[PDB]
Amino acid sequence: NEHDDCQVTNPSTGHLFDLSSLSGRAGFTAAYAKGWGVYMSICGENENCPPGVGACFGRTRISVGKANKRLRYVDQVLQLVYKDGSHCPSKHGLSYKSVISFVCRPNRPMLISLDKQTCTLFFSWHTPLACE
Description:
Layout: E1 2-3, E2 7-10, E3 15-18, E4 28-32, E5 38-40, E6 53-57, E7 63-66, E8 71-74, E9 77-82, E10 97-104, E11 110-115, E12 120-127
């Protein structure tokens, strides 16, 4: 399933996942192993980033994706995908893009991996909000 406004239903059970208590411009710092972190906001722009940007490198404020509210539910996790970030330094003109996977936890996000060859950033966040 996919749905807008920072919420999605599990069509099997009619359970509504709602990430909107994580929303707002103050946002969060995603931890990063190689260097400073990433400012990020859930389902909206981060005030520490350029207009409309949901996540950006904390050192430079360079965009790693425009915010949107399209929450997906897939293989038992919630995902947001911020597209159209800044241009990445690789082979073809590729723009950054952030994937934010929320997994169930019966808590800050982490940047776990950065695909250099697709300029995709993968984040994880363990949260009781993705539980069912």
